[PDB]
Every structure is written in structure tokens, then in C-alpha cells.
Amino acid sequence: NAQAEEFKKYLETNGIKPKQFHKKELIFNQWDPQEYCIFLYDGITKLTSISENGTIMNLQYYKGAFVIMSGFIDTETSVGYYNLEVISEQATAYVIKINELKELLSKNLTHFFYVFQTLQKQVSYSLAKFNDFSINGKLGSICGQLLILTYVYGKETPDGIKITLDNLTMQELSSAVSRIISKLKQEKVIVYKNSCFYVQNLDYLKRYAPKLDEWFYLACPATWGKLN
Amino acid sequence: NAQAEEFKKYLETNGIKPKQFHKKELIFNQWDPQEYCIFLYDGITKLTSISENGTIMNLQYYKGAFVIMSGFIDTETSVGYYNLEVISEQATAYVIKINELKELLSKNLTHFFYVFQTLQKQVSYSLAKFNDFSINGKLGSICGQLLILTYVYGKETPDGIKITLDNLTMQELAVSRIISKLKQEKVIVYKNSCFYVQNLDYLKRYAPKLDEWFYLACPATWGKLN
Ligand code: NA
Ligand code: NA
């Protein structure tokens, strides 16, 4: 990725170095009074929150390159009691205090625009997810998630669109969800063949995740067209 | 709101004047190739999506002051085929072509942050709403909507906290079943054209993460009833 590589060299040009994290580690946590801007450069993370009793609810998944803020740019206070957990075996991230990010995005605009449009992609993503859910319930939500996994890690092969993602991460990606996923398998929308998973009915996923499909077309058109 | 007013002048000083809309008008629409940055200064709007067949999906409700953008600030292309419909009787919005916003946001860090910050409020709003719904179904959802409505339009009366909003405006905000259940549980009561919330702690208990979001995003108004 190009627009994200420039942001990386903008951070390093100002002295910020990368840190390596590993599975189950938290890049930021819900109890820290200091808030940060996380430029996730490589790896897969998930935003999590603990309810009143102790149930860990998964809120959102991110893969580098991306920008996750734990605090408001202006107030520097928390946007929510959230933790950013690594779910890939390793992850590389730049950790900037919200204190200092505001000053760095002022000295430049191409890189403010970069962080600014990631927020926009998040905003529209959630609205599209909400729209698909309101129409097809969780089926649309699960088709949508599999749709973006297909567009991101998918590559066409004779057996269909092969999801080129180690299963140790895909299994990370409860009962209501497991039933839907394997009903798609029973319907041969997605199939297992020789240690790999292939999407064999792409149009099915598009049918029940239309607004997430449109979101990806609008947000990542070049990657959308590969499989369209 | 302090920061909303400082942004208002910045647009006026630079030569963008407010435009008045009335109920049912679309400040922007999903078939328009020109994308805009809308600072809705006053009034209540709703973000919709219209499919080929014509159903109007209601995606989000905004109240001024807020900022809604229909295009990406860098590519200027659509972020989604949406409309911003006015649901109150009147509304006042500053309509800026997205190309022109880049100039204004380029020359100020304070006003850039204001819009940046409101996008963050939206991201965390959606996660909180998602968290509440995955733990308490639609009950927590409507409790959340009623909660923030009570927070913004709350006015104490002898018969509970009055939701000081127009009946036609709240008419525009399954669901009915939940509302009836709420009525039969000593929570919400309807009479004389408005709703009254008598047990506000009930709503906080089933909309905890959106109560947290309101606590974290809108403290001054959160402290009204806390
Ligand atoms: Na934190
Ligand atoms: Na439009």
C-alpha cells in the first residue's frame, strides 16, 4: 500500500519507531488513562470490551495498514473502554500519544487526510454493516464479513476463490455464528479442500451483504474489481 | 456548544452562509455525483438509503450541531449512497462542496480537529450501539435511543422526565411491542402528546455501553441526569 507507506515514513521522519506485538497482547487497554493513536502497520488486531459481568465481546477487527484511536483528538480522553488485542501471531504498530499526534497532523495535510479518511471508512463501514444486518439479520453480517475476507485474502483458482489466510487466524475470526458459517458450507457457498477454504458462490455473499459490498467498492475499488 | 459555534464562524467568515431546509427535503441525496461536507448547525436529520425497490432504510439520526460528509476528504468520491433527510420542521445546514473543504481545513488545525473529532464520536457510537444490541437485543437499542433522547430533551415533571420534543418529530424516530412492554413495566408513560420517563435507571441498565459512550462523548449533557 502506498498512501499508508507515506504515513509510515512521516512517523519515522519525526522519530517514532515501530514496536512488535504478539498474539493475546494488548497494544492499548481500557484501564490506561493515557490514550494513543495506533498506526497498525502489519498484522491483525481486534477491538474488545468487557461487559458488566466479565464477558469479552468482540467489537471490530483491523488489519494493517490502519489507524485506531483510543482517545479523542481534541479532548485526548477515551472514546470507549476498549482494548486492542493482537490476534495474528505477530503485529507491527506505531504508538503515538494522542498528545503528540494532533501536533504532527497539523504540520501536514496529506497525512491528516490519510488518518481522516480512515475514520470515514470506519463510519461508512459501520453504517453499511448496520444496513445489511437490518435486512438479513446476522446472515447478512456473516456474509459481509466473509465477503471482505474474500476480497482481501481471496485469489481465484480452479476450486474457487481460495482464502489465502492461515486457518489459525481464520478460526480466530459463537453458536449462532458457527451454525450460519457451516450452513454456508453445507450449501457449498464456501468449501474445504486439502487444508484450504475456497469461496465457490461469491454472488451469494454479495446478495445478502449488498451495502457492505457497495462499501468495499466505494472504499477499495481496485481490490473490489479483481474478483468482480 | 462552544466548539460548534467557533466552526460556524469559520465557515461564515470564509464566505459560506447557512441554507434553510424544511421537513422531507434532502440536504444531499444518493444519486448526486457531487459530494459535500454538511455542517448541520440546527435541526434534526436522518441518514437514509434507498434501494432499487424504494424502501427507505433509516441508518442514523443527527441533531445539530454536527458534521456529515457524503464523500471521502481525499478522493472526493462517495462514501456510500446515502441521503440526509430533514425530519424536523426546519433545519439550518452549511453546504460545502468537498473540493472547497480541503482549502478551509488546510488552513486551520482547530477546525480540522472539530470535524475529525465528530467522526470519532460516530465510530464509537456505532460500536456502543453494536455492543448494547449484542447483549440486550432491541430492548437495549430502544432503551439507548430513549436514554439519549431523555438526556438531550429531558425535563423533569411531577409525572416523570418529560421528553420535550414534538410528537411529529418523535413519530419519525417489533419496536411497538418493545414500547408496549416498556409501558407495562413502570418505565415510559404516554399522555398529553408526549412521553414521560419515570424509571431512568432501567434504561441505563440495558443500554450500559451507549450510556458510557454518552458519558464519554457528551459529559455536560450526561451530567444533567447523573
Ligand atoms: Na485506553
Ligand atoms: Na451523494
From Swiss-Prot, chain B:
Q: Which Gene3D superfamilies match?
A: Jelly Rolls (2.60.120.10), Single helix bin (1.20.5.460), Winged helix-like DNA-binding domain superfamily/Winged helix DNA-binding domain (1.10.10.10)
GO terms (molecular function) for this protein are:
DNA binding; DNA-binding transcription factor activity
Highest taxon of source = Bacteria
UniProt keyword list: Activator, DNA-binding, Transcription, Transcription regulation, Virulence
- Mention any one GO cellular component term assigned to this protein in its UniProt record: cytosol
- InterPro entries xrefs: cNMP-bd_dom_sf (IPR018490), HTH_CRP (IPR012318), RmlC-like_jellyroll (IPR014710), Tscrpt_reg_HTH_Crp-type_CS (IPR018335), WH-like_DNA-bd_sf (IPR036388), WH_DNA-bd_sf (IPR036390)
**Among its keywords, does the record have Metal-binding?**
no
HTH crp-type domain: which residues? 136-201
Q: Briefly, what is this protein's role?
A: Positively regulates expression of listeriolysin, of 1-phosphadidylinositol phosphodiesterase (PI-PLC) and other virulence factors.
Identification of the protein by name:
Listeriolysin regulatory protein
- What species is given as this protein's source? Listeria monocytogenes serovar 1/2a (strain ATCC BAA-679 / EGD-e)
